[PDB]
Amino acid sequence: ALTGLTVAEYFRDIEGQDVLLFVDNIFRFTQANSEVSALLGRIPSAVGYQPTL
Amino acid sequence: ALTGLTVAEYFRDIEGQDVLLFVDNIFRFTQANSEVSALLGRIPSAVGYQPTLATDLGGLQERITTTTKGSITSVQAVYVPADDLTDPAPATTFAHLDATTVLSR
Amino acid sequence: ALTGLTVAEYFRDIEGQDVLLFVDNIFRFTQANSEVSALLGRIPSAVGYQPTL
Amino acid sequence: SIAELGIYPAVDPLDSTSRMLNPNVIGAEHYNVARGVQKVLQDYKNLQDIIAILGMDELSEEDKLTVARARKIQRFLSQPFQVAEVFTGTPGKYVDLADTISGF
Amino acid sequence: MRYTIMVSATASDAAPLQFLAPYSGCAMAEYFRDTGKHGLIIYDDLSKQSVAYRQMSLLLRRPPGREAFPGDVFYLHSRLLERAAKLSKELGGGSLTAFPVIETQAGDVSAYIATNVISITDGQIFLETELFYKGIRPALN
Amino acid sequence: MRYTIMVSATASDAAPLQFLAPYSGCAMAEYFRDTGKHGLIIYDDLSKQSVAYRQMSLLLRRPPGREAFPG
Amino acid sequence: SNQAVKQRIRAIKNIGKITKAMKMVAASKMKNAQIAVEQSRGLVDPFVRLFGDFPAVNSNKSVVVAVTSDKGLCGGLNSNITKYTRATLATTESEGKDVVVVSIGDKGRSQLTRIESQRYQLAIADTYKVRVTFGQASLIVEELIKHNPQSYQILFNKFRSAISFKPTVATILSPDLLEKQLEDVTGNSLDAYDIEASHERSDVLRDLTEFHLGVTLYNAMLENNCSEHASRMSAMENSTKSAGEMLGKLTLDYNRKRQATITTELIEIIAGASALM
């Protein structure tokens, strides 16, 4: 999702034009960080998510 | 419940018979295995049972089969906690049952 | 609550009289014990309270 | 629960919010049609339990006027999409903004 | 059985063998997908692969989530059911069709593992229990 | 704006900045309370401060309680 | 929240037990009111073979009566005949005639002024409280002869079976100004009868259509009273059923929230013990 913004942020900041960013399931960014954070040695937050959600 | 199997597994494997094993309250087998996994420090799964709920029951129930020498047939009394059939202790027990005999008042 | 009780236990024991003790929010005595009990090295009880509730 | 009624897109109209739904932004009559539609749908939502157990035949006439109007705007918020033509067969419809304000 | 492989990890088997057998079976059927042929796979009770994988995660002292499932129980079925593909003509044109099976509890399709696979799979064949006892079989909703 | 201070710890800011911004804003607003004037502090999303305080406390390994919040 | 469904469960568990009680009191009322409908059905038909049945007559004044229920949990009975009441008050009105609208039952006045506000004149209610008698229907008849119309229209639900209640229009022509005029077909149809009254035929007909009005009113509000108890026996068969299906979906959702509460409370205890141990 950050690679997708960097393409879109370039057209906004440098090219200076109106862009559309369609991100299908930005939840899957949150879920993927929650799989990694079990193994990064963290106390889990509410219902099982990472503390830095 | 494993001790009652082994007496019944002799009558199947050595005597070659059709045996009836009566496990009185299979739910108390589940909840006594849920106690010993909690005493061994294991993290419990959903509603409070052991993480090995399906393989503790599956380790018991899969020894009750028909082999080529005989068979064990098991009549297990089933307690349903909180009158909820979706509770994991009856819902894992119901995966193994081939018949139910409901006795009503 | 223990300080306010000691002032009343003096009047009850040493002066031997009928004392009145109004305690507003005795819930906060148990709540303030649970605010430190995780940092006192105690694994949590039920609803969020200390094992010594 | 809206999609199982067959209403597509399955948008909850009483959960969908925008900061553009503001009478200084979209206009006065767009905003009033929108808040008027949400009031009919909320009033029908309040009637769902008593319709479920007592039935349609026990409400007031003022109530069963809005039950029939909210059942009309529930279906009319649905729309065939041009990308759903491949599995539905119904051709899609690009509705203009003026066509949905005066339609509603 | 002339065309069928049977990969069985039963209830008495160890939980990592039940976790693995959907992947062992999908590798056997990907032989036919990759060499231009066509394959069908039925993972009967991916509901029970999840319980085998929940057992491994909780015995690894990993922090549990919805219904004590691990946070990667989505990815468990996700990387499994994405291998059922229809390849291009430059890769052979072979195909693998998957039929995952999920057992619900009281018709609750909004359970955790059930809604996970509904967002992975393309379609859905919902078999209803009230149609099943009325004699309508296959009890398709 | 000639009467308003805006203390803004937004969502991109660090969790210690969102934990401290209610107190930073109150300390600015306590200037008016302490000098005889009248203040009006508005802590918008005090729910979001405790989410930032929970995050900051689970990473400091302080043991969680109900809904993983600190004691 | 998890008690909000626990209180909602016990509420719907009692609705499905209340409306099972209201269904069986309506079934016990319907069985002993059915034994009075057939004994009242007899006296109706010597009048409609003596006076015929002429619903669409050119009256200049009418009294239309829509007899409904008192209580309103009967389920599509009292609004069904006000659909038929406007269906006749638009059928007769082709000549600019007078109409006085009368309703029997509280659910009739509450739904006739919704459609017909100005020609509504009289409201009879609390008819069905103890029982319906002929002396009661005679007085209700009498204030329909306080107005002096050319006809009367009675709108009631006829108790065919416990399932079907066909709405009936009953019509009574008032005697010497309109009843015999519709009988003036090749002389008169009433000239065959040898009047053995004390006074004249125009005066025996006054006593006879008043007796015809009091009989078809007593039968109207006795047919409609047990067409109401049969409609209440099935409106509480759809209510006990629907509140048993609602309670079924509500105990299943409580048991999901019961189980999810124990897992949530347990995970927070394990996450807090693992932070220390």
Side-chain angles (χ1 to χ4, degrees), chain A, chain B, chain C, chain D, chain E, chain F, chain G residues 1-140 142-277:
Chain A
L2 280 85
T3 303
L5 311 197
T6 311
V7 177
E9 282 177 314
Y10 185 85
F11 295 135
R12 177 199 71 191
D13 294 327
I14 306 298
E15 309 287 330
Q17 51 190 294
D18 307 334
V19 296
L20 287 156
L21 177 55
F22 307 92
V23 184
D24 213 325
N25 266 326
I26 204 61
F27 167 79
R28 303 293 186 204
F29 160 82
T30 315
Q31 188 184 49
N33 289 270
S34 160
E35 303 174 28
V36 177
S37 153
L39 312 160
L40 294 168
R42 291 183 195 171
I43 308 175
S45 180
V47 318
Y49 287 93
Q50 73 272 24
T52 75
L53 178 136
Chain B
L2 308 192
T3 310
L5 259 177
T6 310
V7 192
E9 282 175 278
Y10 187 87
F11 295 141
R12 179 184 65 184
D13 292 334
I14 308 298
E15 314 266 321
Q17 307 182 173
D18 297 357
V19 191
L20 254 181
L21 173 63
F22 296 89
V23 179
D24 206 46
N25 226 340
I26 196 64
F27 169 70
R28 292 196 289 241
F29 167 80
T30 291
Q31 89 169 19
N33 278 87
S34 177
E35 286 174 55
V36 311
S37 97
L39 293 179
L40 300 177
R42 296 169 181 193
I43 294 171
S45 79
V47 204
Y49 305 103
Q50 63 269 47
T52 82
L53 169 62
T55 46
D56 274 334
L57 266 159
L60 178 76
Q61 300 274 65
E62 287 286 275
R63 298 161 65 174
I64 302 163
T65 56
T66 305
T67 77
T68 51
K69 292 165 282 301
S71 76
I72 305 175
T73 310
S74 187
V75 177
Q76 294 158 353
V78 182
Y79 179 76
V80 176
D83 199 72
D84 184 12
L85 293 184
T86 72
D87 202 76
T92 313
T93 317
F94 291 161
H96 299 275
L97 300 185
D98 304 71
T100 68
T101 294
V102 170
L103 307 174
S104 68
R105 293 189 165 276
Chain C
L2 292 191
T3 292
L5 182 47
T6 311
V7 184
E9 286 183 271
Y10 190 82
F11 297 142
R12 185 202 69 204
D13 295 335
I14 301 304
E15 302 195 337
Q17 61 216 345
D18 302 358
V19 199
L20 254 49
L21 180 60
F22 306 95
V23 182
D24 205 318
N25 273 333
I26 203 56
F27 171 78
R28 310 290 189 190
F29 161 69
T30 65
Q31 183 179 41
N33 292 309
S34 70
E35 292 193 278
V36 294
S37 291
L39 298 178
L40 287 182
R42 315 187 196 174
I43 64 184
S45 171
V47 186
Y49 300 99
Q50 68 275 18
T52 57
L53 180 64
Chain D
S1 302
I2 297 194
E4 286 185 21
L5 267 62
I7 298 304
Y8 281 112
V11 171
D12 198 357
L14 306 177
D15 253 327
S16 302
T17 314
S18 183
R19 294 183 181 277
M20 310 284 296
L21 204 65
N22 191 41
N24 324 122
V25 178
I26 48 174
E29 76 160 35
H30 184 183
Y31 173 73
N32 288 322
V33 168
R35 292 305 189 192
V37 162
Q38 282 159 358
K39 195 194 176 316
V40 185
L41 287 170
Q42 180 55 48
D43 284 2
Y44 174 48
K45 188 187 247 188
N46 291 281
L47 294 167
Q48 293 274 20
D49 43 358
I50 190 180
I51 286 165
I53 57 182
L54 291 191
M56 186 69 177
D57 289 329
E58 282 80 0
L59 311 169
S60 174
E61 177 61 34
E62 185 67 26
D63 273 329
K64 75 175 57 183
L65 168 82
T66 84
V67 176
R69 273 173 184 179
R71 283 208 189 102
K72 281 180 198 73
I73 60 187
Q74 264 178 9
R75 313 295 197 278
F76 188 49
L77 285 160
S78 60
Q79 168 175 334
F81 281 171
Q82 318 199 10
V83 303
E85 296 179 356
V86 66
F87 58 91
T88 295
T90 305
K93 279 303 179 301
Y94 184 92
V95 184
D96 297 309
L97 178 56
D99 294 351
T100 168
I101 292 166
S102 58
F104 272 99
Chain E
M1 191 55 73
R2 187 194 165 182
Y3 308 97
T4 316
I5 323 174
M6 168 87 49
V7 183
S8 85
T10 57
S12 85
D13 287 6
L17 272 183
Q18 307 180 40
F19 145 81
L20 199 75
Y23 297 103
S24 298
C26 196
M28 292 173 186
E30 269 185 326
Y31 165 70
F32 305 106
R33 184 199 63 179
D34 288 324
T35 49
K37 289 174 279 287
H38 298 283
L40 193 69
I41 187 148
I42 287 90
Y43 321 100
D44 209 285
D45 278 321
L46 281 195
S47 293
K48 290 173 179 175
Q49 193 211 19
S50 307
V51 173
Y53 187 58
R54 181 175 65 179
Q55 170 178 335
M56 297 167 51
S57 306
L58 295 166
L59 292 178
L60 283 168
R61 319 281 307 186
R62 285 175 179 180
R66 273 289 165 106
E67 313 177 29
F69 276 107
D72 70 290
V73 80
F74 171 78
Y75 177 54
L76 171 87
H77 298 159
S78 200
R79 65 184 166 174
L80 169 75
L81 290 161
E82 281 270 309
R83 294 160 78 181
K86 166 61 181 173
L87 302 190
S88 46
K89 299 308 173 193
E90 292 90 19
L91 270 81
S95 68
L96 176 60
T97 313
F99 279 69
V101 176
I102 284 285
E103 169 196 317
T104 59
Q105 284 308 123
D108 188 31
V109 293
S110 76
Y112 188 39
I113 308 296
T115 39
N116 271 351
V117 192
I118 289 165
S119 55
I120 292 152
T121 53
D122 309 313
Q124 171 197 346
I125 296 175
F126 186 47
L127 299 177
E128 179 63 28
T129 177
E130 186 64 29
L131 304 184
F132 197 80
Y133 291 152
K134 289 189 302 181
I136 314 175
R137 289 156 151 93
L140 198 137
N141 197 335
Chain F
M1 269 320 276
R2 59 185 293 236
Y3 310 110
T4 306
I5 318 177
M6 174 96 44
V7 180
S8 177
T10 51
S12 63
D13 287 6
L17 284 177
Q18 321 182 27
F19 146 76
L20 270 193
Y23 303 108
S24 299
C26 183
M28 297 183 190
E30 274 182 314
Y31 170 70
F32 309 108
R33 177 183 57 81
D34 293 331
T35 54
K37 285 159 275 288
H38 302 287
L40 178 63
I41 180 85
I42 292 180
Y43 316 98
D44 212 325
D45 306 341
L46 209 66
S47 287
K48 284 183 185 52
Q49 181 213 7
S50 55
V51 169
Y53 180 62
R54 171 180 61 190
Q55 166 184 337
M56 208 184 59
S57 299
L58 292 176
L59 297 168
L60 283 179
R61 282 280 170 166
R62 315 203 193 180
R66 188 187 161 198
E67 314 182 28
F69 279 103
Chain G
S1 293
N2 203 14
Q3 271 295 320
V5 287
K6 192 60 174 185
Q7 275 297 284
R8 215 193 197 275
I9 273 176
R10 196 268 316 155
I12 310 298
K13 201 195 292 184
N14 213 12
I15 282 180
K17 197 171 282 290
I18 281 162
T19 68
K20 203 177 180 181
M22 283 194 283
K23 174 192 136 300
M24 63 167 188
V25 310
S28 71
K29 267 186 158 180
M30 188 212 69
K31 183 178 179 180
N32 55 71
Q34 193 175 357
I35 75 168
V37 174
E38 307 305 309
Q39 306 298 279
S40 175
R41 267 169 166 181
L43 189 44
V44 184
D45 63 0
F47 291 100
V48 301
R49 60 169 160 260
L50 192 80
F51 293 147
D53 182 80
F54 309 121
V57 303
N58 194 3
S59 155
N60 51 80
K61 191 178 180 179
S62 179
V63 177
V64 60
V65 181
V67 43
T68 65
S69 171
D70 268 323
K71 314 171 185 176
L73 207 56
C74 54
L77 193 86
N78 315 312
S79 68
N80 193 19
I81 54 181
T82 73
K83 292 192 301 179
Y84 277 95
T85 308
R86 74 171 323 276
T88 67
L89 292 181
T91 303
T92 63
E93 286 291 334
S94 171
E95 294 85 1
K97 80 172 66 184
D98 200 301
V99 164
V100 156
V101 183
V102 166
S103 65
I104 305 163
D106 274 321
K107 290 294 299 307
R109 53 163 193 85
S110 285
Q111 291 172 8
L112 274 174
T113 77
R114 174 276 191 261
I115 184 63
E116 215 289 325
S117 302
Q118 273 77 15
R119 304 185 307 248
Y120 191 80
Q121 294 249 23
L122 177 59
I124 292 96
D126 297 317
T127 289
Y128 313 96
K129 303 295 279 294
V130 278
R131 70 200 74 84
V132 167
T133 60
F134 191 80
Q136 170 194 39
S138 302
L139 288 160
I140 302 172
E142 275 185 45
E143 287 102 16
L144 307 184
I145 315 113
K146 288 306 183 63
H147 322 87
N148 290 314
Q150 310 290 110
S151 178
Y152 300 89
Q153 309 282 344
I154 322 292
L155 266 302
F156 67 104
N157 293 272
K158 186 156 185 69
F159 183 73
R160 296 308 304 158
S161 44
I163 313 107
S164 51
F165 324 108
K166 267 82 76 176
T168 312
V169 186
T171 310
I172 309 104
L173 302 167
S174 61
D176 53 356
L177 42 80
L178 203 70
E179 159 60 42
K180 53 208 307 169
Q181 289 185 3
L182 266 301
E183 307 286 334
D184 269 350
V185 182
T186 74
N188 198 315
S189 175
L190 200 66
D191 287 339
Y193 296 90
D194 195 56
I195 307 298
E196 305 200 351
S198 60
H199 293 71
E200 210 266 328
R201 191 180 78 187
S202 68
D203 194 19
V204 75
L205 257 61
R206 176 75 63 170
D207 294 331
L208 201 55
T209 74
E210 293 179 9
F211 186 38
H212 177 32
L213 174 67
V215 164
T216 189
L217 212 58
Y218 169 75
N219 185 68
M221 64 176 46
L222 207 69
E223 287 257 15
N224 195 275
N225 186 34
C226 88
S227 296
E228 157 204 339
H229 298 333
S231 197
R232 197 159 290 121
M233 191 202 58
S234 70
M236 303 283 100
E237 248 294 322
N238 294 333
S239 287
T240 286
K241 170 181 173 183
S242 296
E245 298 165 290
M246 170 174 291
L247 184 71
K249 295 181 174 52
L250 216 47
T251 58
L252 292 183
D253 185 57
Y254 161 73
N255 276 329
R256 289 191 289 262
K257 290 169 171 301
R258 173 191 71 90
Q259 288 178 36
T261 304
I262 312 182
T263 317
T264 307
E265 292 284 325
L266 199 35
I267 284 169
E268 288 166 8
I269 286 168
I270 297 152
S274 301
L276 293 156
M277 307 193 295

